[PDB]
Design an enzyme around this catalytic site. Structure first.
Site, PDB file in Angstrom:
ATOM      1  N   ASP A 147     -19.085-100.070  38.861  1.00  5.98           N
ATOM      2  CA  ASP A 147     -18.489 -99.447  40.055  1.00  5.98           C
ATOM      3  C   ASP A 147     -18.323-100.503  41.157  1.00  5.98           C
ATOM      4  O   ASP A 147     -18.824-100.360  42.286  1.00  5.98           O
ATOM      5  CB  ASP A 147     -19.347 -98.275  40.536  1.00  5.98           C
ATOM      6  CG  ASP A 147     -18.697 -97.477  41.671  1.00  5.98           C
ATOM      7  OD1 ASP A 147     -17.453 -97.509  41.832  1.00  5.98           O
ATOM      8  OD2 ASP A 147     -19.448 -96.809  42.413  1.00  5.98           O
ATOM      9  N   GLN A 170     -25.057 -94.825  37.373  1.00  2.00           N
ATOM     10  CA  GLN A 170     -25.539 -94.885  38.764  1.00  2.00           C
ATOM     11  C   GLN A 170     -26.632 -93.836  39.060  1.00  2.00           C
ATOM     12  O   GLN A 170     -26.387 -92.845  39.765  1.00  2.00           O
ATOM     13  CB  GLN A 170     -24.367 -94.693  39.723  1.00  2.00           C
ATOM     14  CG  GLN A 170     -23.339 -95.809  39.672  1.00  2.00           C
ATOM     15  CD  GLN A 170     -22.277 -95.670  40.750  1.00  2.00           C
ATOM     16  OE1 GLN A 170     -21.507 -94.708  40.754  1.00  2.00           O
ATOM     17  NE2 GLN A 170     -22.230 -96.637  41.673  1.00  2.00           N
ATOM     18  N   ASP A 196     -24.340 -96.993  52.698  1.00  5.17           N
ATOM     19  CA  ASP A 196     -23.511 -96.204  51.792  1.00  5.17           C
ATOM     20  C   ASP A 196     -24.233 -95.003  51.174  1.00  5.17           C
ATOM     21  O   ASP A 196     -25.425 -95.074  50.838  1.00  5.17           O
ATOM     22  CB  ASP A 196     -22.961 -97.105  50.688  1.00  5.17           C
ATOM     23  CG  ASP A 196     -22.132 -98.262  51.241  1.00  5.17           C
ATOM     24  OD1 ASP A 196     -21.468 -98.081  52.294  1.00  5.17           O
ATOM     25  OD2 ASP A 196     -22.149 -99.356  50.632  1.00  5.17           O
ATOM     26  N   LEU A 255     -28.981 -88.346  49.748  1.00  6.95           N
ATOM     27  CA  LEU A 255     -30.365 -88.859  49.568  1.00  6.95           C
ATOM     28  C   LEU A 255     -31.469 -87.897  49.124  1.00  6.95           C
ATOM     29  O   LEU A 255     -32.230 -88.205  48.183  1.00  6.95           O
ATOM     30  CB  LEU A 255     -30.885 -89.487  50.847  1.00  6.95           C
ATOM     31  CG  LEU A 255     -30.193 -90.769  51.289  1.00  6.95           C
ATOM     32  CD1 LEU A 255     -30.881 -91.293  52.541  1.00  6.95           C
ATOM     33  CD2 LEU A 255     -30.187 -91.821  50.186  1.00  6.95           C
ATOM     34  N   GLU A 277     -32.150 -83.781  47.941  1.00  9.46           N
ATOM     35  CA  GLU A 277     -31.477 -82.719  47.239  1.00  9.46           C
ATOM     36  C   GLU A 277     -32.436 -81.531  47.181  1.00  9.46           C
ATOM     37  O   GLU A 277     -33.557 -81.694  46.754  1.00  9.46           O
ATOM     38  CB  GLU A 277     -31.156 -83.220  45.833  1.00  9.46           C
ATOM     39  CG  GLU A 277     -30.413 -84.561  45.766  1.00  9.46           C
ATOM     40  CD  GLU A 277     -31.216 -85.741  46.290  1.00  9.46           C
ATOM     41  OE1 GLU A 277     -32.418 -85.521  46.488  1.00  9.46           O
ATOM     42  OE2 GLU A 277     -30.675 -86.879  46.517  1.00  9.46           O
ATOM     43  N   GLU A 314     -21.159 -95.382  56.296  1.00 13.88           N
ATOM     44  CA  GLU A 314     -20.124 -94.991  55.337  1.00 13.88           C
ATOM     45  C   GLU A 314     -20.470 -93.564  54.953  1.00 13.88           C
ATOM     46  O   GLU A 314     -21.497 -93.307  54.287  1.00 13.88           O
ATOM     47  CB  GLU A 314     -20.123 -95.861  54.093  1.00 13.88           C
ATOM     48  CG  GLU A 314     -19.048 -95.479  53.081  1.00 13.88           C
ATOM     49  CD  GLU A 314     -19.357 -94.203  52.308  1.00 13.88           C
ATOM     50  OE1 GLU A 314     -20.330 -94.210  51.514  1.00 13.88           O
ATOM     51  OE2 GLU A 314     -18.619 -93.202  52.496  1.00 13.88           O
ATOM     52  N   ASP A 348      -9.633 -99.620  49.296  1.00  8.45           N
ATOM     53  CA  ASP A 348      -9.197 -98.446  48.549  1.00  8.45           C
ATOM     54  C   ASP A 348      -7.739 -98.076  48.879  1.00  8.45           C
ATOM     55  O   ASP A 348      -7.054 -98.733  49.678  1.00  8.45           O
ATOM     56  CB  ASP A 348     -10.112 -97.257  48.853  1.00  8.45           C
ATOM     57  CG  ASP A 348     -11.498 -97.414  48.257  1.00  8.45           C
ATOM     58  OD1 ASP A 348     -11.653 -98.105  47.226  1.00  8.45           O
ATOM     59  OD2 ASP A 348     -12.435 -96.801  48.817  1.00  8.45           O
TER      60      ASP A 348
END
Ligand SMILES: [Ca+2]
Ligand SMILES: [Mg+2]
Ligand SMILES: [Mg+2]
Lengths: 523, 529
Positions: free
Chosen positions: A58, A148, A180, A185, A187, A222, A290
Site C-alpha cells: 500500500d 495491513q 494517518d 484506532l 473499535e 489526515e 491521489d
C-alpha cells in the site's frame, strides 16, 4: 505566532524527486542536493511521503519499521544530513506517522502470529475484514487491506509504542507528523468504530505529550471528512488534539466553479466553516498524490465534473479523476495562475504538489494513480535530470510526450525563462508572505453582481486585502459592494498602483479579463 | 473590396523555412511541403524574401538575375509548383522586386563594364543601363566612376534609359505571367537622380511608378504593389498617387511599430494614438501595412534621440543586442518571453487599421541567436518539431545555413510547431484563433478608427466602425490592474458585448462615461450593440 499557520507546504515523494546514485529511484542524498531549489521556490515546509521500510503493498503506508529508512531511499544517516541541510536553509520538515496499522512484515506481527505463548507481542493486534492467519490459526482484524493488520490500542504497551515511534523522529529533529488513519484506532461493539471518544482520548494525550516534551512541533490530521466532522479532531482549548486538519470540500469546488463560471459553491463551503481553537489552522490544496476526489459532492455535481474534466474513461478512478493540475486546466497558464492565487488567498495553509510549479502532466499509461507520481523534471537531460538511469529503468518512467515532456517542461528552462510558471509561483508566494492577513486574517465574502466573480476580504492587524477573481473565460462585469470601505482606495499589491477611491454608497464597478485575479489592499 | 485590404501577411525566408534535400539550406520543395501549416494558421498572403540568383553581399537584395531562382533554393520548376500549390490552398504570394539596382555580378553589368564599345566593334547597348561619370566607385575595367546609392556591388540602374524602364516591366511581367500575386517594390524612392536636388522622391520616379502601376492595372488586374519605402506616413502618402493617377496600392506605416514597444515600457500609450490619430488620408484603393517585427533589427530611426536612448536601455541592456540604429532581437525575447505581453501587442497590431505582416516563427514564440553576426540571429531556421534540427533539416545543427536555436528557453526541444499543435493552450493555437476573430469582423480590415477618452494613459481605447458594425477595443499597457473611465457618450443605450463568448456587459447610460478595470496587459475585444 505558530509557524504552521503561515507555512506554505510542499508535498513530495523521496522515491520520485531526485535519484542521487543512478539506480533509478529517488533518495535522500538526491533530495539534499535539491534543497536550494525548494528554498528559493518560497516553500516553508516539506511534507514527505512515507520513507519507511516496507514491501510497498500500500505504497509504504503499510509500515514494517517505524524507526527506519526504506533501504532504496538511503540510510538513517542520509536522513539526518537531509534534515540538517533542510534546517540550515529555513525549511521545516514533516513525515507520515501511520497510527492505525502496520504491515504484516513488521517484527511485532511476525511475533504476534505465534499463538498466545511460545509471547508479549500477541496482544498488539486484534485476534479471534477478518483473515485466517495460517500460523496462529486465528482471524485477525484489518480495517484496510489483508496485509495491513489493525493495531490493538486497548493494550497500553501499544500506546507507548506509538508515543515511542513519534519520539524517535522528534528526537532526530523532525518538525511534525501528518498523522494517518486516526479515526479507526479504537473499535467498540455495535457502534460506528470511527470517531469514538476513547480514540479521541489517545490523541489528546499524544498531543499533550508533544506539547510538553516537544513544543513547536506539528500534528496534522489526515482524516477524510467534512469540516463539520473533523473539527472534533482539533480538540478544545482545554483538551487540544491536532493543530491542523484538512479542508477537503473547497478543493473540488474550485475546479467545478471554473467550469460552471459560477463561484457560488466556494462561498457555500468557505463561508460556512465552523469555528476552531485559537491554535488551529485549516489545510488546503489543489492536487496531491491521489486522484482528484469527488466524494464530497452531489451525484449531479460529480457527473458535471466527469463531463467537464474526464472526457476519456481512462481518466476516471475510484470516485475521482486521476489527472494532474495542468492537464485538468488544458495547460492554460491563466487558469493555472488563477486557481493557485485563489488557493493562496483563502484561509488555510496551502499545500503545493511537487511538479505543479513547472506545469507537469500525467501518464495514464500507468496503473492506479501512478500517472501523477512520475519523476520530477529538472532539465532536458537524460531522464529529465532525475537520474543517470535511462527512462525505462526509473521507478516510474519520466514523461516524454510533446506537450508535458521533460524536453519542454523542466526546472532548468524555467529558471532561465524570465516569465516562467516557476518564477511566477515564487513571486506569488513572496507576495503572500508580505501580507499577514493571508495567513491569519478573517474571511468576508462580498457581493459582486455576478456569480462568475468571487470577491472577498481578508482582515488582520489593520490590513485589509481585497481579492477579486474572475472564474469566466471571457470579460466579466461586477458591482462590488464595498460600502464598509467608503473613503478607501483599493491599491495594487504588485507595484502599489492605486485605483479609484470607494465613494458614495460604495458600490464599486469593475470589469475583469478572462480568469483575471486582482490582489488589492484597502487603506 | 480588394483582397490585400483584409489580408494577413506572413514574411518568410525560403532559405530558413524548410530544407527539402538535407543540404542544410531551405528551399522551394521544402516550402511547398509546409503549405498546409500556413493555410491552417489563417494567414492569407506569403511575402517571400529575395529568391533570385545573387552573391548575397546584401542578403540577396543584390540581384544577379531577375528571371531566375537562386541555385541553392531549387529550380524555376520548383517555383511554379510552389505557386500552383499555394493558390490551390487559397494563398496569395508576393516577392521582392529590387528596382533601384542590381548586383555587380549581373550580366547586364558584366557587359556594361566593357565600356561603350565591344572589342569586335559592336555598340554596347548594356553600357547605358547603369550611370557613369568622371557613392561613386572607380571601375578597373571600364575606366569610369559608377553611381551606387547603397554598396559598391549595387550599381544604380539608369532609369532615364527607356530600355531600363522596359527591363523592369519585363521582370515584373515574367513573374506576373507565372501567376505571382504582387511585389514588395524595393528602393523606389531612389530611382531617378538630378543636379542640385535630393535624388529622392523626384516627381520623375513617380512618373515611372504611375506607369508601372498603369501597366499592372491594365494587363494584370487584382495584383498588388506594396511600397518598401522607409519614410514617415505624411511623406509616404505620395507613393499611393492620386485616384486619377495611381502608384502603389500599399505603403508601410513604420512609426507605430517602435511606439508599441515604447508605450509598453512607459505604461503610457500616448505616442500610439498620436501617430495613429494624425495619419494622412489615402485613396479609395489604398491600404496601410503594419507590423511588430521582421528580418531586420527593430529600427529606432523614426523617434527622438531621447526616445532612442530609452529604448536601448529598456530593450537592449546588453550591447550585443544593438546594431546599426536598432535592436537585433526577436519579439519574444523583447517581451521577456511573457505570453501576456506577446498576446497584447499582437492583439493591438491586429486591431489597428492596416494589413498586419507577421514574421515567421513569432507565432510559436521563437528567440534570437546574438552570437550570430549582423541580424542573422533573428533569421534562424523555423522550428517544426523536436527532431534533429527542429525538423528544419536532417543536416545536423552546425551544418544548417544558420544554426537552429537550442537553448533551454527557446530551443526547438521546447519551442516547436508539433508541440504547440498538440497543446490546447499554445501560442500557435492562440494566434490561429485570434486571426479567426479578426477575420469574422470586417471592421478590423475596412472600418475607420476613432480613439476614445480613458482617464488613464495606460489604457488605450478605440472604435472601429464599418457597415453598421461598431467594435470597441480596450487594451491595458501596464504590468498591473488599471482603472479607466471610457467616454462612450455616443453609444448611450448600447451594451458592449464580448467578441468571444458573446457575453454582454452593462449597458451604457447617462452621460455615457463607462467605468472599467483591467488586469495586467489585458485586452478587451468588444462589439457595441
Ligand atoms: Ca537609381
Ligand atoms: Mg537512488
Ligand atoms: Mg535545401
Amino acid at each position: 505566532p505558530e509557524w504552521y499557520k503561515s507555512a506554505v507546504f510542499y508535498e513530495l515523494s523521496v522515491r520520485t524527486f531526485q535519484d542521487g546514485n543512478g539506480d533509478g529511484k529517488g533518495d535522500f542524498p538526491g533530495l539534499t542536493s535539491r534543497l536550494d531549489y525548494l528554498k528559493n521556490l518560497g516553500v516553508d515546509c516539506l511534507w514527505l511521503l512515507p520513507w519507511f521500510p516496507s514491501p510497498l503493498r500500500d505504497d509504504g503506508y503499510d509500515v514494517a519499521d517505524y524507526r527506519g529508512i526504506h533501504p532504496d531511499l538511503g540510510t538513517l544517516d542520509d536522513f539526518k544530513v537531509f534534515l540538517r541541510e533542510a534546517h540550515a536553509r529555513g525549511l521545516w520538515v514533516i513525515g507520515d506517522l501511520v497510527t492505525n496499522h502496520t504491515s504484516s512484515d513488521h517484527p511485532w506481527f511476525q511475533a504476534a502470529r505465534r499463538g498466545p505463548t511460545l509471547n508479549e507481542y500477541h496482544d498488539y493486534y486484534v485476534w479471534s475484514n477478518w483473515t485466517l492467519d495460517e500460523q496462529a490459526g486465528k482471524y485477525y482484524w484489518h480495517r484496510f487491506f489483508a496485509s495491513q493488520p489493525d493495531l490493538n490500542y486497548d493494550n497500553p504497551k501499544v500506546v507507548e509504542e506509538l508515543h515511542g515511534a513519534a519520539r524517535f523522529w522528534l528526537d532526530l529533529g523532525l518538525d511534525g507528523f501528518r498523522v494517518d488513519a486516526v479515526p479507526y484506532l479504537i473499535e467498540r461493539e455495535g457502534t460506528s468504530c470511527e470517531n469514538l471518544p476513547e480514540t479521541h482520548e489517545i490523541l489528546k494525550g499524544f498531543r499533550a505529550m508533544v506539547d510538553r516534551e516537544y513544543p513547536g512541533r506539528l500534528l496534522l490530521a489526515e482524516a477524510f471528512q467534512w469540516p463539520e466532522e473533523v473539527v472534533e479532531y482539533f480538540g478544545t482549548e482545554a483538551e487540544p488534539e491536532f493543530h491542523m486538519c484538512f479542508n477537503f470540500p473547497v478543493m473540488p469546488r474550485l475546479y467545478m466553479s471554473l467550469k460552471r463560471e459560477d463561484t457560488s459553491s466556494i462561498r457555500e463551503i468557505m463561508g460556512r466553516l465552523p469555528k476552531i481553537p485559537s491554535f488551529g489552522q485549516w489545510c488546503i490544496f489543489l492536487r496531491n498524490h491521489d486522484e482528484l476526489t469527488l466524494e464530497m459532492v452531489t451525484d449531479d455535481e460529480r457527473a458535471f465534473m466527469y463531463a467537464a474534466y474526464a472526457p476519456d474513461a481512462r481518466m476516471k478512478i475510484n470516485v475521482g479523476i486521476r489527472r494532474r493540475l495542468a492537464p485538468l486546466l488544458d495547460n492554460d497558464r491563466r487558469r493555472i495562475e488563477l486557481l493557485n492565487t485563489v488557493l493562496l488567498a483563502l484561509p488555510g495553509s496551502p499545500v503545493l504538489y511537487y511538479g505543479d510549479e513547472i506545469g507537469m502532466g500525467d501518464d495514464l499509461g500507468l496503473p492506479d494513480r501512478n500517472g501523477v507520481r512520475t519523476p520530477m523534471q529538472w532539465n532536458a537531460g537524460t531522464s529529465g535530470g532525475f537520474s543517470t538511469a535511462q527512462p525505462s529503468d526509473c521507478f516510474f518512467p519520466p514523461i516524454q510526450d510533446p506537450v508535458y515532456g521533460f524536453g519542454r517542461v523542466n526546472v532548468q528552462s524555467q529558471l532561465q525563462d524570465p516569465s516562467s510558471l516557476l518564477k511566477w509561483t515564487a513571486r506569488q508566494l513572496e507576495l503572500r508572505r508580505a501580507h499577514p492577513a493571508f495567513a491569519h486574517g478573517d474571511l468576508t465574502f462580498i457581493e459582486t453582481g455576478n456569480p462568475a466573480i468571487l470577491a472577498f476580504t481578508r482582515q488582520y492587524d489593520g490590513e485589509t486585502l481585497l481579492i477579486v477573481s474572475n472564474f469566466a473565460g471571457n470579460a466579466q462585469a461586477g458591482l462590488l459592494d464595498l460600502a464598509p470601505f467608503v473613503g478607501r482606495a483599493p491599491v495594487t499589491l504588485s507595484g502599489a498602483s492605486p485605483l479609484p477611491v470607494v465613494t458614495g454608497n460604495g458600490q464599486y464597478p469593475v470589469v475583469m479579463g478572462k480568469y483575471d485575479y486582482y490582489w488589492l489592499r484597502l487603506n
